[PDB]
Amino acid sequence: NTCGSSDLTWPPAIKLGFYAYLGVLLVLGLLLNSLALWVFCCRMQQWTETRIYMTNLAVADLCLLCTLPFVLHSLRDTSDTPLCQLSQGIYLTNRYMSISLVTAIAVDRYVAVRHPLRARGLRSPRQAAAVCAVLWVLVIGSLVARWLLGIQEGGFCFRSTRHNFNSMAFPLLGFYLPLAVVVFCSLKVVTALAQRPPTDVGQAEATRKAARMVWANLLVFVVCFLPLHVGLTVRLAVGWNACALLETIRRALYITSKLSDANCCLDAICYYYMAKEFQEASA
Amino acid sequence: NTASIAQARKLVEQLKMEANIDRIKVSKAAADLMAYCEAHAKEDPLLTPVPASENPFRE
Amino acid sequence: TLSAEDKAAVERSKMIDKCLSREKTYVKRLVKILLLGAGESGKSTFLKQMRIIHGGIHEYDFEIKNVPFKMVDVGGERKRWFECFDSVTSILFLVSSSEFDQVLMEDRLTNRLTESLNIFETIVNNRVFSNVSIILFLNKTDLLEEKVQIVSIKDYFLEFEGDPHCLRDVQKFLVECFRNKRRDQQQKPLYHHFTTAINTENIRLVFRDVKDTILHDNLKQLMLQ
Amino acid sequence: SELDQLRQEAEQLKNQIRDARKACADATLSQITNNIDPVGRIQMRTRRTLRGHLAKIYAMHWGTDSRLLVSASQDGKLIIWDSYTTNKVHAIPLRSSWVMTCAYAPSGNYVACGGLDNICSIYNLKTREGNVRVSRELAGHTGYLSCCRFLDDNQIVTSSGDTTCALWDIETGQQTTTFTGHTGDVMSLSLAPDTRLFVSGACDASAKLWDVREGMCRQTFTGHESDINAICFFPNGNAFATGSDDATCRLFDLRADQELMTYSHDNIICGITSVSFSKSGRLLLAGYDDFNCNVWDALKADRAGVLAGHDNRVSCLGVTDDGMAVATGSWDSFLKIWN
Amino acid sequence: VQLVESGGGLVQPGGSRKLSCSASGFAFSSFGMHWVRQAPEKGLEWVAYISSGSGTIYYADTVKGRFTISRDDPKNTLFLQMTSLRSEDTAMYYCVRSIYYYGSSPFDFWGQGTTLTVSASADIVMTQATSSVPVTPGESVSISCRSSKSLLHSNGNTYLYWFLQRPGQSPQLLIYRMSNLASGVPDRFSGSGSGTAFTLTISRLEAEDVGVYYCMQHLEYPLTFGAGTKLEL
Ligand SMILES: CC(C)CCC[C@@H](C)[C@H]1CC[C@H]2[C@@H]3CC=C4C[C@@H](O)CC[C@]4(C)[C@H]3CC[C@]12C
Ligand SMILES: CC(C)CCC[C@@H](C)[C@H]1CC[C@H]2[C@@H]3CC=C4C[C@@H](O)CC[C@]4(C)[C@H]3CC[C@]12C
Ligand SMILES: CC(C)CCC[C@@H](C)[C@H]1CC[C@H]2[C@@H]3CC=C4C[C@@H](O)CC[C@]4(C)[C@H]3CC[C@]12C
Ligand SMILES: N#Cc1cc(NC(=O)C(=O)O)c(Cl)c(NC(=O)C(=O)O)c1
Ligand SMILES: [Ca+2]
């Protein structure tokens, strides 16, 4: 049986490039999410649904950025390291919780834009708290189920074998349905912000800025989380009886991991900073 | 009350009624207010807070 | 330590709180529209046309698209104590479009259109109305079209740079005047509509403008604008 | 006779009244109360947080028992609740959701409400049917109701949008006495303890004292600069405080017929929505348009305390008859109690 | 204000029945209800209680679990379903309305009730000083009562109810909470007490003042009446 559990060798130039990428990321995104949590907890007032969503998103991003160095350090164990297990578990928890949160924000925008009248009795800060709590619970349960299904046949750490058609089921089912929901919500919001009654140029500029922001959020989500799950999807095409292309797939996934971790930085510059309320509160 | 002058004659009469009232010195009124505020200074939780046992809201 | 009467009173208060919470849903889902006129602007005809959908303060409560609309009419804002309408969703402002040559009944050398614009300016400049949206209904559109061809509006208003004796140009001029007389042109949108008492789709325009206003404030609550 | 002659006579009478007030003003309230020791910083905490209103609270009133509190909400509800256990004793919906004033009868048997509708609605709390029905819907005003107060189980004084005040009876049900001396929009009413006089402020700077039995304005006070919105009689009955759209709260005396002091501060720039006196009369509580209320020294004219427990504009403010607690209601649908 | 009770008759022991009380003239949904019983040779005895919102339902220790009580607010009806009747249930049942708030008058109106015949403790005990005292019109009579425990509560107001039952008529609220007079009663009645011993003073007696006077406590859900003092002409 072709194990293929060999370390991935990178040229010195590509290694220094990845080191600089991870440094710029772990500095910039860390500072952005820290300032976001600092302003979204004590500075801003009137706790609303989107404020709770942004607070949970910033918490998840900070947790992911803090757990990424542990994963990078304990990545080279390949068999049974509990440190790697915990680090990667918290990492996947944070990543999929960020995905779920982006999905909840898209659903909230769909409810508040497509059905404005029918949203006065379906949106509340307690509803936002309940959604955040149930998403946290669902993500933690999915990660515990993945750990349980991997520890019995194979492993959970990134270098395990037999990533089964049930262990890697939560990844391919925890992004595709959220991706479809986000696409649907973004399309309905941008088509609801276009059929508004004609008014002064101020409201037109405002709705154009809102549509641009929604499109930017959608494009960021796609470009950060889709390329990873394209490799995760094509990885299940060749399992046990794999070949030399397994190393290429592993290298592609390692490269896309950085693009998926850059989402914690690209969401701060698309959800928090591009918003006018955050700028008015911080300044 | 001719030539639509009742709108001002009534006001003039009312002002005349007010100008003939008896007025006391402001000093005596201030002294009376001080005496009333000092006489009832007690039994008032606002001016002098009462213990929690005597307060129906605290206990 | 609560006695029997104390526990029963607490239970009665809990039932009252439950009823109040049940009505709180209808209160939150309620959309309040303050209706105001400008004098001889087709108020009675508009109310008669609206009572079809419905069926000094007058309240018209109805349900459209499974949401409740309550229109409150003062019956004909100069007391500084009318801040009770600081939580209404929108304000309808009815103006007669045939007030160019229609001098005020007081005949004090003033057109009714100037008085309507002054009332609109005094109402929109109120601080309590900064968070509320405005829907301008210019009635007598057919009368405006039939009158603009007879008498030109340039004679009584020396600021109409457009082409007189037309219809769309006069409507655009009136909308521009009503919009520029307001001094915020941002906090909340302004909606203009030209209709008469013939058509019955006037409530659909009000519903669309209310939906646009709710979308506009949801965009602020969502940090999208 | 002549309009110019009448105007000249009115100006002469005004100058005579001003000269008499200046002659009777040999000193000032501050100069006399300077020797009085200050009250000091007071600390009033939220003992009870009465919640349940679906909209902004607009008015309040205390009964003789100093335990039941009535509050009116813009959602068309009068809630009468116990202050000791925060239990809602009654919750009656209104025919007109726009209510601006509520009054609790001294005997506790009746309640009154009014607002943008010109109909003053009086309900009977004590009934054999159990549900508080609408006893009377008395309406003869030409403007929106602004304030209501109960003289007894039969006599009730009300003020409307027009410059008139009305004393009604329950037996006949009509407007028994009419007062037409004001010029602006009358806002608030406060009955004297002897139930024979009441001061009323209007949209102008004139606050007029009216007698219940005679029916004429005995005295008037023109010293403010904007519309008087709040009123409160002194516990003794010969003084009353007036709050207006400016931060100034001016104290007038009936016997001296002149203003005594003007409680105001440069920091405060908002208006006044409710003014109430303590039982002793030493501390004067005033609700401002900002998100807090103030308590001044009625004698020394100094800001003794600040209550910043409300998140929205303080609308109504009342002090119990025994002086035990102070109720404060703002537009955040929250009624609070301070001790 | 009217309560009509029906569903009474001769029932063999061990059977079942359903007493129905129709309410009119008042908001039935806003009043709690109490089913009480009175034996032909004994005094009043509390049976069951249901709240206004059907949230608080309690029964006496003698009928705990044996009986059940429900109410229909859209129909303004009160149902008492009894099963396995015995000789202790052969009595006349009364339905009483009671609303509970500050200053309220619980047990204000008593229904006519209905009779029921059969062919066949940690509770407050109320003791009357005398079962029957001769009285004369125009005099003053003081009825004394004793309780097992003090009826004073930490809230500050006592819970003691003096009721009058005229011969051949339904009971009526005379004094509630030992201090306040009921609605529609003469001011000749007065109540006093220190917490354990209670006194009801009646001056200038009339023809309608005769009958049986009962005392009740309202501190715990198992409400207990007294022996009742009989004032005869
Ligand atoms: C209408 C209110 C309650 C918001 C509803 C949002 C629902 C429909 C959306 C928002 C977030 C979404 C979740 C986002 C990601 C996850 C975690 C994944 O491992 C399982 C699927 C699951 C759980 C998605 C299911 C659908 C979902 C729950
Ligand atoms: C594992 C899960 C269940 C625990 C962590 C969930 C956290 C991150 C989420 C879920 C519930 C959320 C809280 C629920 C209550 C509120 C109400 C709101 O007025 C302030 C925000 C606040 C405080 C929310 C902040 C974020 C929150 C604490
Ligand atoms: C902007 C979006 C589309 C970026 C998408 C990035 C993905 C599609 C790119 C970025 C890095 C790329 C990989 C870089 C590493 C290798 C190994 C090399 O021997 C062959 C190409 C291969 C296998 C690439 C496959 C495609 C890849 C994973
Ligand atoms: N950080 C990180 C990271 C994540 C990942 N992600 C996954 O392995 C995965 O998607 O399961 C990967 Cl495959 C790699 N590269 C590997 O060779 C490996 O450890 O598998 C690195
Ligand atoms: Ca590999």
Residue numbers in the entry:
A (entry chain C): 6 to 288
B (entry chain G): 5 to 63
C (entry chain A): 4 to 18, 34 to 73, 206 to 226, 230 to 378
D (entry chain B): 2 to 340
E (entry chain H): 2 to 121, 135 to 247
How did the manuscript describe this experimental structure?
The orphan receptor GPR35 belongs to class A GPCR, first identified two decades ago, and remained poorly characterized due to a lack of pharmacological tools to probe its physiology and pharmacology. Human GPR35 is mainly expressed in the gastrointestinal (GI) tract, predominantly in the stomach, intestinal epithelial cells, dendritic cells, and macrophages of the small intestine and colon. It plays a critical role in regulating GI homeostasis and provides an important link between metabolic, immune, and gut microbiota systems. Upon coupling to agonist-bound GPCRs, the G12/13 subfamily activates the Ras-superfamily small G protein Rho A, regulating numerous physiological functions, including cell growth, differentiation, and actin cytoskeletal reorganization, and is involved in pathology processes, such as cardiovascular disorders, metabolic diseases, and cancer.
